[PDB]
Amino acid sequence: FRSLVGTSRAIQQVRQMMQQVADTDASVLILGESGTGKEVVARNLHYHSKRREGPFVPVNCGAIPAELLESELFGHEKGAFTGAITSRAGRFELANGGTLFLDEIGDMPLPMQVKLLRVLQERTFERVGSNKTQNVDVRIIAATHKNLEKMIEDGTFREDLYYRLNVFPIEMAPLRERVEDIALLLNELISRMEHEKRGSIRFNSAAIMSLCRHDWPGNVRELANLVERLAIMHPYGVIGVGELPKKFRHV
Numbered sequence: 001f002r003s004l005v006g007t008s009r010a011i012q013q014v015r016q017m018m019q020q021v022a023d024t025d026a027s028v029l030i031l032g033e034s035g036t037g038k039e040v041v042a043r044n045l046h047y048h049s050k051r052r053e054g055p056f057v058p059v060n061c062g063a064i065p066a067e068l069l070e071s072e073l074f075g076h077e078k079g080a081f082t083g084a085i086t087s088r089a090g091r092f093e094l095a096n097g098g099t100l101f102l103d104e105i106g107d108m109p110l111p112m113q114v115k116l117l118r119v120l121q122e123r124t125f126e127r128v129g130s131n132k133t134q135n136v137d138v139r140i141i142a143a144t145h146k147n148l149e150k151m152i153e154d155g156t157f158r159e160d161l162y163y164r165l166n167v168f169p170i171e172m173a174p175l176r177e178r179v180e181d182i183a184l185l186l187n188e189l190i191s192r193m194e195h196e197k198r199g200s201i202r203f204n205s206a207a208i209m210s211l212c213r214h215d216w217p218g219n220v221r222e223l224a225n226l227v228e229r230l231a232i233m234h235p236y237g238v239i240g241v242g243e244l245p246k247k248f249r250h251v
C-alpha cells in the first residue's frame, strides 16, 4: 500500500470511510477520475481487511477480448472451446479468500455484468464448459470514472448490479479540487523517487503556485509523470516557473 497523502477535507473523509468499510466484507465502489488514487484506496482497503493476507486480484474490464472474457473471469476446463488444451482458473477462482478488484467496472460488457451479479448474490460460478458449480469467496471492490446511473439510463449498465455493488460508495476528488494537497503530494512523490535510486528535485513556491493553478486532467498520475520528467531534465535541481513545461505555467 501507499497512504493517501493530503489534508483537504475530501481526502480526510475518504480516509474516514476507508477506515469504516475496510474490515467489513461489503462491496466497495470507488468513483473518481483517472489518476485520482482509486486503486491505492482499493489496495489499502484490502491490506486492512479480513482478506489482508489472501490474494489481491485486478480485473481490467475493458482490456480483455470479449471472445475470452468469460473464460478469463471464470476459468475453463479442457476442451471448452478451441485452444482449450489446458484448464484455466479464472480471476474469480484466483481471488477466492482475497479481494477482487474490478478496475473500470463501467467497461464490463452486459453478459458479464449479469454473471458478476449471479456471483455476488449466489456466491457460485462454473468454469466455462464445466458442469461443476464451484462456490467462491471474494470481496468485491470496483472502480469507475464513468457515470454509472447515466449508463443505467442508457441501458448500458444493469440497475440490479448497480445497487448490489454500490453498497459503500467512496468518491475521489480530482486534484484540481484539492490543490491544498499538491505540495504534500509533491513531497511524497519526490521522497519515493529518492528512496528508489531514481533521482531528486524540489520545487520552489512560485512553481508550486503555478502547479496549484493547473487543471490536472490526469490528476495525481500526471503529477507523478511531471516529477519524474523534471527529475530527469534538472537532476538534483530546484524547479522554478521557468523549468516547468509551458503547459504547466500559470502566472
Ligand SMILES: Nc1ncnc2c1ncn2[C@@H]1O[C@H](COP(=O)(O)OP(=O)(O)OP(O)(O)=S)[C@@H](O)[C@H]1O
Binding pocket: 002, 003, 004, 005, 006, 032, 033, 034, 035, 036, 037, 038, 039, 040, 041, 104, 143, 188, 220, 221, 224
Ligand atoms: N493520495 C495519494 N497519496 C499518495 N500517492 C497517491 C495518492 N493518490 C494517488 N497516488 C499515487 O499516484 C498514482 C495514482 O494512480 P491510481 O491510484 O492507480 O489512480 P486510479 O484512480 O486507479 O487511476 P486509473 O483508474 O488506473 S486510470 C499511483 O502511482 C499512486 O501510488
Ligand SMILES: [Mg+2]
Binding pocket: 039, 103
Ligand atoms: Mg487502476
